[PDB]
């Protein structure tokens, strides 16, 4: 944990008995790396050139290190995790030096009798067990599906990272024993963040849960759902769930009530405690 | 401020870093409490001067060696900033050193009239005003054979436009005339350079810093002409610069100023220079107004006038340190707080 | 029809090749303003 | 319909873009030129910085002025409804008369509220006059937004 | 043929120009004079509210532009004459590019006036009189555009 | 979707069983590294599984 | 010489317009038919490309403005060179705004049938993507330059005193409102635009 | 005044950042798309050219494969590992420094550096 | 550094030659892919042997 | 054909130009001479209402523009001859771009005259003499525009 | 066809341009000479009405435009030939852009002569002698436009 | 639907994708190479660690070369205006992005290699600044490689 | 229609611009970096023959233009397609306006490098290393133009 501590203390030295930010960094920084660096071939190369420095850390410790190799050897355990997570996520993708892995059984079958050179579709048999499916490789519209998947992946993992690091503020204000800071900053922050982008991250999962073809319903667009949740409340063109038009008004009012509340609770109750 | 940091990004931020080494009022009060030049050296060693007198070691340490080395590191910092300059910035840095080249010309050709040796009249010369033919001004006496032999290849060559050589070689009376006239033509040319090619935030705050140089030089010429000069006003008006705040109405009255009251009633009509000639040390009034004009030139960000405002403030810092080290070495402390600190 | 000389296709080739030539003139005026710091290369 | 040709949303989305780009240009000039003057007095009397953030806030309001009219032009644009060329010219004009209004108001706030903040470190009695000149230079964009709102309601 | 479909374009850009160039001139007149106000009330704090008269004098230019642009706005129509669009374009230019001129004049007069009025107290009346002669240019532009806009939709037809 | 909840049960029970059986030497980095990495592995597995559970786009290619 | 060309093009435009207007053919300079008959894919692809281009030329602009002064100001005070990288980050986010708007716009970019090619909706979604790419690329350009300037002032006021960076980070926040507002407006403009059909 | 202005700045900053960071985490999709597409179009330019069922066993057709594998491998190591994963590393770094260390991290403290002869 | 590139040249090209030999659909399965599998495997396996010669020769350095 | 639909365009931009290019010359004559009054009357404030004659003679040419703009405005119609539009454009340009010249001349002469009339008081009668020649340049343009505007609708048909 | 509808456009542009550019030239010649006068006789104000000659000779070349912009104005009809409009445009440009040059020359020679005639008293004769050559430029432009305008309606149909 | 002027936009997109990217890479090489040559006359042992800005500027030109090669393999005589303008957009994206990224790498790089010789702690600073300016070429490469995939569909 | 008459215009402009703009680039690279040779070989003329490498690497850009100009010139024809003219215009610009950039970079780096290599002899290897990255820009433009010109007349009708 020394390299993660130096990485997190380069930005800002924490205050006294604050929650360390280099103790959640030790997994999330190689994992947010691996989401961007997803390949079992490049990931195994990086894991191998990190494990070369981990297994030889006694001969390299008693050695003069120049600045670039001092940077690379001070973090010989950030790169081992950055390779070990890159192998995992490039096994989630089918990306082994930009190739697919036909490990499991596919959820898509291609038609047996078709003319040469024509555009064909695949029929869904099941769902691929672990990771993304390998019938999207030499595919014309495979990149559209990978765009949708990786965009919603980034949205949900950013939501998870933000709502995980936002609870540490509550733990800080609880350790300082300041209920004024809790009711002034954490709760109006929590039910502002979760009422908009927690709702977006829930709506992505709920659109993934419904079938929208067996039901013969239109699949809603989630960009112009959050556009129309703020502009035209109560008007739902493509219904996503039962009771959407009246619950989005409640979430909009819960988000809009916390713009004066987070701005006016703490100064007006610090002023009241001087009387 | 949108096209500044292309060629001047690194240049400003180091000069802005050099600004933070300007001694504040508390760092001057901590220097006035010293008892020995060694204690003043050790007090300066905690500032951004740190270990500049390290090769002296408490025995050969005089109050002139401090003024030598503290200004020498100013000159080396100016050369480092000038070496990273290119284009209009490098030309702006050259135009600063032209005014020191003029002083070194006028100091070099007075060391040959008095027949003082050439190796000792050049250690008193200014290091920033160095051109390659500066020692070769000890070859002739008259102005024409020093222009047409040496000063043609110098960048001071367009400034010899009104110096009329009547085949009288040189006394000490006309070398000051040549000095004032070269500085007059130089102030004209550098004001036209600032107005022409320097961008707009570094234009208005540099025209004021340069018009102040012109006004101070006009008042000093029109006031030093009382005691050691008997000249006509039509020949005196060729020595006063015409770029400043003081030119079109007041340098006329400074030209026909035969008495001290002819200067004082001429400077009573200008608004920011009135009261300078009434009370106090006049040189301290000009240095105080120089520092108040250099202080509010750091407050405009994306400007190349910060180089001028830095080096004049750092020269005033070296002058204040020299005045303090002169006070604490000659044991006179009645006017040790006569320094000038706006930072 | 829009015109016979200034047709629908020529007049939108001369907009693409005007935008690209504008970006070219701007970029060449950026590279033309590139000067060398000669004082850090001399002996002095 | 000869009064609603199919090229009419070109001038409506041009109204959106002229309402947003030039108003955020004015807001950016007003916040950058004034932040230069606020940071210039950062060392000399640092305690007058948090009081002097008013020409940054009043510059940022000029982007809200363009945001409101950009939302109100973009809400009147749909590919299924009929959209007259009168409506498109009117949205072009109401974006164009708020974009240069907020641009001029941002130039005025940027030129006033850095000279004022930069001279305010000498005289602490300048602040009321600085705020007053900023109000007179910030109602310039409010005039254009009023014209844009009246013009939007007229043209639809 | 006489009331074409592209006819409100000229009235629309005339309604735009009477805000664009007028607010540009008013912004110049407020900015360049406020530089002089903030530069002279450093050592003259008591003259801080006597010096606002250039800035108020430039704000009345933007009020002049506002009035003419609103009064043009309430005469734009869909089935508008091309004569009416030409008149509204002329009335917009006549306020805009004359209020720009009056704003240039007030911005260049007013900073010199507040720089000289801090040094001479009797120069304030002269500053106010020169600013009246500078504001009357934008007043002339407003007079021309109000006499012009009143002729749009008098004898229009088709 | 219940084969995501069924994997969440065996990941959450494993993380709770590791919270109480972490080694005492470096507790705040044993139960912080291992419990958070199981959470992020399950999150990327659930996201890459639910995007293919009910897809809207079929894979379409010409050369086969 | 550029003013000579600006005057020459203006004189040629005035002479051509008055020649076309005097001879009774002034409706031949027809900008509406030009808009009706040019391909909507020009406006759509040009808007996408100028969105992601002009976001990056503002992001990279701000990056050198508050990068060169950060490195210059870090010579004497090297304790800014990592903390003050949030001024690079605030002017770098205006490029990811233009990127995630350009991809959402390019999702609306399919092959339209030639029988309904210059239709109402296909021409609408060319105009909308063009101006909604322009209003995002230009807004992120201006926001990147403003955040770069207010970060270049912050990088020097940080090296002056450490307590000034917190006070002048607020100006970078108010400057970085602008790219997010352009992000909002460019999504509202192409919100009702359909694909090319 | 030092509490009300600070809470206004905190409210504006937090409500800005809740929108500005969930769109800034889309670089996890941006750089992943860039890495996948560059690793695809490097394979397709280097070793997709080396695969041919003609001249099977010829010396020219096997030195073709050797040279194209060397050109592929040095380009993967030089770009797609060293000069691409460093950018992914720095982007996962700024996602911690800004998007994660602004929800809870105050950061107003100073480091414990004791009087020690092992650090001189 | 040639021994590292040569070891990867053994491993990667041996796996590629085996995937051409067994007619794996990520290498043969497209129309633009080569038609004969073992004809490509015969010229990739010889390159694997060439890189093995480079790995053995640079392994004694 | 003889009175087309676009015919009031030239009349509208001749009504507009006769105040635009006139007021932006009057603004130069006001500003450039007012910075010469405000910089001179800090020492001689008794000459304040005597040096303001360049500002008055710069304001007179704006009235010269106003008269011609009103007389061109009240001769506009929806169905007017294209000859009338050409004549009104010619009158507007003849007032505007010559009152611009008269304003440039008054602005350049006036500050040079008021900065010199405080050193020598016998230069005021020379400043008035040069300034009458500088101010009659706009009166010549007013004469040309009134002789045009009297010819505008004299023998027009259709 | 010989007398189109757009034919008075060139005549109106010529009638405007006859006085517009001569007013610009006269403005330059009055402005620089007035600066020269007001800067040369703060010391010797006896030469005030003597040095007024450049301002008068710059004001004459605006009367040169005022003559032809009345003689072109009184030949403007609705149904006039295009030949008449072309000649009236040529006459307006021939007076205007020549009196502009004459005004440039008078404005430069005027202040260059009145700033030097305060030193040498017999530079005044040379100043008048050069300003005559600078004012016959506008006289030549007047002659050219008066010969054009006597042909604009000579044998037109 | 597929006119005769339609491969003008694709050919000029293939042109501009290498032209503007090489202009940006040339600015990033030349301006940051002046800083290398100016720095390494007084401290020459920093010569091969200051070489990073011209390497990143070369990576920019490689990003432009990739788009130019991938556009010129989709050109034909009888392609539609859809393919033509989407190749034009794929050219403009990487062109403006490589031009901007190369200008930024050039202006940051010489200042960085000048501050690195005075303060050794600025090497990590200039590298961390130049990595943000490097990926702007990636941000145009993403749009270029996405518009390439929609060429013939 | 597929092979119009104005189609060799773009091909001739592509044949011209490939040598014109690479001659501009090579001319700037020879000029700017030859001024530095002539300035720094008046003091140390022993290293005259090793400072010539910026001039040679600048002159390689003109050969890059010459190859593409010859290969476009030997594909021109009277009845060529408009596609061929568009591809030859693109291949001319891809070599010309990229070798112009490469020649700018070679001139700037060479003039900055041969002036610093006489004070520090270890800077020569760094100068060569930067000039290789400056010359591969024109090499990349050559690659793009050859891949266009192979595509120029392939399946044309």
PDB file of C-alpha atoms in Angstrom, chain A residues 23 27-28 31 85 88-89 108 110 114 118-122 124 127 129-133 135-136 138-141 145 149 208-211, chain F residues 1 28-29 32-34 36-37 39-64:
ATOM      1  CA  UNK A  23      -7.234   2.543   0.896  1.00  0.00           C
ATOM      2  CA  UNK A  27      -8.488  -1.857  -5.919  1.00  0.00           C
ATOM      3  CA  UNK A  28     -10.406   0.857  -7.749  1.00  0.00           C
ATOM      4  CA  UNK A  31      -9.904  -1.618 -11.902  1.00  0.00           C
ATOM      5  CA  UNK A  85      -7.602  -6.930 -13.489  1.00  0.00           C
ATOM      6  CA  UNK A  88     -10.200 -10.446 -15.931  1.00  0.00           C
ATOM      7  CA  UNK A  89     -11.881  -7.678 -17.898  1.00  0.00           C
ATOM      8  CA  UNK A 108     -26.594 -16.679 -31.012  1.00  0.00           C
ATOM      9  CA  UNK A 110     -26.318 -18.281 -37.504  1.00  0.00           C
ATOM     10  CA  UNK A 114     -27.733 -18.714 -46.921  1.00  0.00           C
ATOM     11  CA  UNK A 118     -25.529 -11.380 -48.280  1.00  0.00           C
ATOM     12  CA  UNK A 119     -26.290  -9.756 -44.936  1.00  0.00           C
ATOM     13  CA  UNK A 120     -27.719 -12.196 -42.378  1.00  0.00           C
ATOM     14  CA  UNK A 121     -28.859 -11.966 -38.765  1.00  0.00           C
ATOM     15  CA  UNK A 122     -28.493 -14.427 -35.905  1.00  0.00           C
ATOM     16  CA  UNK A 124     -31.048 -15.771 -30.077  1.00  0.00           C
ATOM     17  CA  UNK A 127     -27.386 -15.902 -23.102  1.00  0.00           C
ATOM     18  CA  UNK A 129     -22.488 -17.367 -19.475  1.00  0.00           C
ATOM     19  CA  UNK A 130     -19.456 -15.277 -18.527  1.00  0.00           C
ATOM     20  CA  UNK A 131     -18.675 -12.048 -20.315  1.00  0.00           C
ATOM     21  CA  UNK A 132     -19.563 -10.607 -23.680  1.00  0.00           C
ATOM     22  CA  UNK A 133     -20.533 -12.911 -26.552  1.00  0.00           C
ATOM     23  CA  UNK A 135     -20.686 -13.744 -32.163  1.00  0.00           C
ATOM     24  CA  UNK A 136     -20.198  -9.956 -32.151  1.00  0.00           C
ATOM     25  CA  UNK A 138     -16.804  -9.822 -37.349  1.00  0.00           C
ATOM     26  CA  UNK A 139     -20.126  -8.043 -37.107  1.00  0.00           C
ATOM     27  CA  UNK A 140     -21.400  -4.901 -38.833  1.00  0.00           C
ATOM     28  CA  UNK A 141     -23.606  -3.743 -35.946  1.00  0.00           C
ATOM     29  CA  UNK A 145     -23.921  -2.947 -29.203  1.00  0.00           C
ATOM     30  CA  UNK A 149     -22.808  -1.738 -23.337  1.00  0.00           C
ATOM     31  CA  UNK A 208     -31.980  -4.546 -19.298  1.00  0.00           C
ATOM     32  CA  UNK A 209     -34.411  -6.570 -17.162  1.00  0.00           C
ATOM     33  CA  UNK A 210     -37.443  -6.174 -19.435  1.00  0.00           C
ATOM     34  CA  UNK A 211     -37.632  -7.883 -22.812  1.00  0.00           C
TER      35      UNK A 211
ATOM     36  CA  UNK F   1     -32.425 -11.859 -14.007  1.00  0.00           C
ATOM     37  CA  UNK F  28      -8.318  -2.935   7.093  1.00  0.00           C
ATOM     38  CA  UNK F  29      -6.543  -3.980   3.869  1.00  0.00           C
ATOM     39  CA  UNK F  32     -11.005  -3.835   2.060  1.00  0.00           C
ATOM     40  CA  UNK F  33      -9.159  -5.240  -0.953  1.00  0.00           C
ATOM     41  CA  UNK F  34     -10.919  -8.599  -1.208  1.00  0.00           C
ATOM     42  CA  UNK F  36     -14.262  -4.482  -2.850  1.00  0.00           C
ATOM     43  CA  UNK F  37     -12.735  -6.544  -5.667  1.00  0.00           C
ATOM     44  CA  UNK F  39     -18.003  -6.222  -5.626  1.00  0.00           C
ATOM     45  CA  UNK F  40     -16.387  -4.782  -8.755  1.00  0.00           C
ATOM     46  CA  UNK F  41     -15.991  -8.192 -10.423  1.00  0.00           C
ATOM     47  CA  UNK F  42     -19.673  -8.890  -9.748  1.00  0.00           C
ATOM     48  CA  UNK F  43     -20.629  -5.429 -11.023  1.00  0.00           C
ATOM     49  CA  UNK F  44     -18.859  -5.868 -14.353  1.00  0.00           C
ATOM     50  CA  UNK F  45     -20.207  -9.426 -14.646  1.00  0.00           C
ATOM     51  CA  UNK F  46     -23.769  -8.253 -13.977  1.00  0.00           C
ATOM     52  CA  UNK F  47     -23.431  -5.393 -16.458  1.00  0.00           C
ATOM     53  CA  UNK F  48     -21.981  -7.681 -19.141  1.00  0.00           C
ATOM     54  CA  UNK F  49     -24.695 -10.279 -18.456  1.00  0.00           C
ATOM     55  CA  UNK F  50     -27.740  -7.976 -18.382  1.00  0.00           C
ATOM     56  CA  UNK F  51     -26.818  -6.288 -21.673  1.00  0.00           C
ATOM     57  CA  UNK F  52     -27.238  -9.697 -23.352  1.00  0.00           C
ATOM     58  CA  UNK F  53     -30.162 -11.061 -21.332  1.00  0.00           C
ATOM     59  CA  UNK F  54     -32.803  -9.280 -23.445  1.00  0.00           C
ATOM     60  CA  UNK F  55     -30.996  -7.607 -26.356  1.00  0.00           C
ATOM     61  CA  UNK F  56     -32.577  -5.145 -28.759  1.00  0.00           C
ATOM     62  CA  UNK F  57     -29.904  -5.405 -31.480  1.00  0.00           C
ATOM     63  CA  UNK F  58     -29.182  -8.676 -33.287  1.00  0.00           C
ATOM     64  CA  UNK F  59     -25.682  -9.437 -34.621  1.00  0.00           C
ATOM     65  CA  UNK F  60     -25.616  -8.840 -38.359  1.00  0.00           C
ATOM     66  CA  UNK F  61     -22.757  -9.664 -40.719  1.00  0.00           C
ATOM     67  CA  UNK F  62     -22.276 -10.326 -44.426  1.00  0.00           C
ATOM     68  CA  UNK F  63     -19.027 -12.309 -44.722  1.00  0.00           C
ATOM     69  CA  UNK F  64     -19.486 -15.814 -43.324  1.00  0.00           C
TER      70      UNK F  64
END
